[PDB]
Amino acid sequence: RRQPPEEVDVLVVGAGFSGLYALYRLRELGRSVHVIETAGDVGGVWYWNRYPGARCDIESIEYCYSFSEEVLQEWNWTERYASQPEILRYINFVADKFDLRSGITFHTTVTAAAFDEATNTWTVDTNHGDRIRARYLIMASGQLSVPQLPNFPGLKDFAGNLYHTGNWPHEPVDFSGQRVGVIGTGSSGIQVSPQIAKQAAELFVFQRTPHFAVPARNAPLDPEFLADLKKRYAEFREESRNTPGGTHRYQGPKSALEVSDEELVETLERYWQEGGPDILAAYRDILRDRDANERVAEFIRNKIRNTVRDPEVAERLVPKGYPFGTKRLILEIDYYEMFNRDNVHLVDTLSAPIETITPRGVRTSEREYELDSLVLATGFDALTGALFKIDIRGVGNVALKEKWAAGPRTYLGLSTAGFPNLFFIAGPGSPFTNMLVSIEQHVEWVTDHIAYMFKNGLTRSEAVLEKEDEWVEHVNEIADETLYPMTASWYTRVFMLYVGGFHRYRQICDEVAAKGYEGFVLTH
Numbered sequence: 001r002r003q004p005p006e007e008v009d010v011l012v013v014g015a016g017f018s019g020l021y022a023l024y025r026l027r028e029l030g031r032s033v034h035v036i037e038t039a040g041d042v043g044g045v046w047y048w049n050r051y052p053g054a055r056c057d058i059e060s061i062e063y064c065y066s067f068s069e070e071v072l073q074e075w076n077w078t079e080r081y082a083s084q085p086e087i088l089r090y091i092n093f094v095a096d097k098f099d100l101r102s103g104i105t106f107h108t109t110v111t112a113a114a115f116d117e118a119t120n121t122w123t124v125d126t127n128h129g130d131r132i133r134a135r136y137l138i139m140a141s142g143q144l145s146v147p148q149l150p151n152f153p154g155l156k157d158f159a160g161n162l163y164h165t166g167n168w169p170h171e172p173v174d175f176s177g178q179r180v181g182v183i184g185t186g187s188s189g190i191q192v193s194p195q196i197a198k199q200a201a202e203l204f205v206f207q208r209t210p211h212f213a214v215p216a217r218n219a220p221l222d223p224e225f226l227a228d229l230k231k232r233y234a235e236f237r238e239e240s241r242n243t244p245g246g247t248h249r250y251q252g253p254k255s256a257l258e259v260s261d262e263e264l265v266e267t268l269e270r271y272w273q274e275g276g277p278d279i280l281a282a283y284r285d286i287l288r289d290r291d292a293n294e295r296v297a298e299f300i301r302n303k304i305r306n307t308v309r310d311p312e313v314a315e316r317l318v319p320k321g322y323p324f325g326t327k328r329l330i331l332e333i334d335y336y337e338m339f340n341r342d343n344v345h346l347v348d349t350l351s352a353p354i355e356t357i358t359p360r361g362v363r364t365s366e367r368e369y370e371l372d373s374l375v376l377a378t379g380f381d382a383l384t385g386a387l388f389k390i391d392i393r394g395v396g397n398v399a400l401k402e403k404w405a406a407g408p409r410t411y412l413g414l415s416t417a418g419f420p421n422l423f424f425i426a427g428p429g430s431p432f433t434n435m436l437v438s439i440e441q442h443v444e445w446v447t448d449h450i451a452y453m454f455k456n457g458l459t460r461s462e463a464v465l466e467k468e469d470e471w472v473e474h475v476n477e478i479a480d481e482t483l484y485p486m487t488a489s490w491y492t493r494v495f496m497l498y499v500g501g502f503h504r505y506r507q508i509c510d511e512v513a514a515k516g517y518e519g520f521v522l523t524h
């Protein structure tokens with residue numbers, strides 16, 4: 001185990017995409033920097049989430065680093081949407097190339113962080129009893145990094161094999177001949193289930209809220225196409241950085257409501273056949289007008305009923321009541337087709353809720369299911385989850401958990417008043433988008449600022465209370481013009497993610513920096 005140093009200019013928490021780039025860039029800026037990571041190796045979500053079928057919902061050519069021209073040119077994606085093992089190889093490739101592991105302490109969990117106003121330094125403690133003093137602390141601790149604690153009664157009494165998708169075994173699990181249950185029909189459950197169906201004697205899928213999901217239409221990435229792209233990657237990447245989604249995606253000019261029924265079909269069928277999440281932009285108002293939303297939502301509801309041959313199964317799979325695409329659109333590869341199989345059973349817990357786990361399996365209010373294995377695809381804590389497991393204390397020894405008790409309040413999503421020299425990467429108040437575009441922007445902003453602090457001899461950077469309030473207000477106002485607040489997931493009041501688009505978000509941050517970091521108080 002690599003032991004962390006006693007002092008460093010910057011301490012990073014987390015060794016996924018975000019923390020690795022921060023480590024990379026601070027080295028390039030001539031700053032001392034070190035990374036603390038719980039996991040045994042690099043990767044973050046792509047180290048932990050090793051379940052069969054784990055796959056990205058952003059195209060390979062967009063979900064990737066761009067800071068290295070060498071990496072863009074030497075690496076070769078294989079599919080439209082990269083599988084978890086490929087991406088982890090990608091990340092491992094970059095870590096080897098840039099010798100990043102020499103600045104990471106693995107197997108170690110930051111447990112406390114307290115700011116010393118007298119030394120303008122953070123004292124950072126871990127479960128191994130390390131104590132690290134760093135001028136700045138970067139939290140690259142993720143948004144989907146803490147598996148939600150499934151709190152079913154009787155869970156400990158389950159006789160069989162228990163698995164969670166967010167912490168899958170590092171050796172492949174053979175489900176052949178078994179009765180297997182999957183609890184959760186979000187992205188992880190929609191991804192892992194069709195893999196397990198290929199092996200299990202019987203699969204039971206326990207669904208509570210049904211969610212929208214459209215075909216991935218995954219495919220091999222044509223080498224020639226890729227070799228053409230590599231000749232223009234930097235320009236292609238700048239194009240992505242000038243979109244709302246941080247990805248190439250057609251912006252439909254037509255309102256969903258000003259079109260004939262037959263056109264709406266033909267147009268949506270194009271997207272349904274082409275696959276991917278781009279259908280979200282099919283018409284300009286899908287996320288701004290409920291009637292428009294519904295019109296698009298009914299098209300997809302009918303695609304479900306037309307895929308599932310049992311009308312009773314099909315309609316339990318149809319999402320109703322909540323707007324389409326207000327929750328990040330799931331892509332599915334043969335998930336709906338899966339229920340046409342003899343060995344697959346959809347279990348509607350809204351109809352009959354889970355009363356307890358038993359030695360033998362799962363007991364709903366109406367019957368008991370005997371299972372050899374139980375797979376929990378039950379999601380993660382709120383994006384505040386990883387930070388909230390750390391005892392973070394700022395000015396006046398106030399805890400971060402107390403300050404974010406009624407929602408995570410920040411300035412720009414990067415810092416919060418009363419906690420100086422503390423930055424959050426791809427965290428609350430930041431933009432929802434292609435996380436690699438957003439991570440790169442965030443890491444460059446944060447480390448640029450740290451470089452500015454050192455160049456000018458300043459040692460304390462702190463967001464101004466009033467600007468933080470102003471930002472929460474602004475984030476709330478943008479979202480309110482949207483269907484997003486209609487989905488409770490965006491609160492933990494503080495609407496959690498900026499929905500004004502990556503491009504508008506980058507422009508805001510750039511102008512803050514060009515104006516001497518307006519809204520931060522910088523002192524020595």
Ligand SMILES: Cc1cc2nc3c(=O)[nH]c(=O)nc-3n(C[C@H](O)[C@H](O)[C@H](O)COP(=O)(O)OP(=O)(O)OC[C@H]3O[C@@H](n4cnc5c(N)ncnc54)[C@H](O)[C@@H]3O)c2cc1C
Nearest residue numbers: 014016017018037038044045056057058109110141142435
């Ligand atoms: C299966 C899956 C698919 C996804 N697909 C997409 C997609 O298609 N598009 C997209 O935009 N996003 C996607 N995401 C979101 C994903 O989180 C981001 O794309 C990106 O990987 C986040 O990188 P990160 O380094 O900021 O966070 P993470 O990858 O979560 O890294 C955080 C790291 O910090 C570590 N850590 C946390 N707390 C501590 C602590 N106290 N001490 C030490 N270490 C700590 C964790 O162990 C973890 O390794 C997906 C996520 C998952 C799980």
Ligand SMILES: NC(=O)c1ccc[n+]([C@@H]2O[C@H](COP(=O)([O-])OP(=O)(O)OC[C@H]3O[C@@H](n4cnc5c(N)ncnc54)[C@H](OP(=O)(O)O)[C@@H]3O)[C@@H](O)[C@H]2O)c1
Nearest residue numbers: 055056057184185186187188189208209328377378379380
């Ligand atoms: N690229 C990809 O394909 C991919 C893969 C994984 C994750 N992601 C992203 O990362 C995030 C996490 O996705 P996720 O699927 O793992 O979690 P999730 O989206 O929050 O869904 C969790 C599922 O488990 C169910 N569940 C949770 N607790 C339950 C309980 N006590 N009883 C019954 N059912 C319960 C939920 O039902 P309810 O809906 O009723 O609560 C839900 O269906 C998502 O935002 C997703 O976009 C993307």
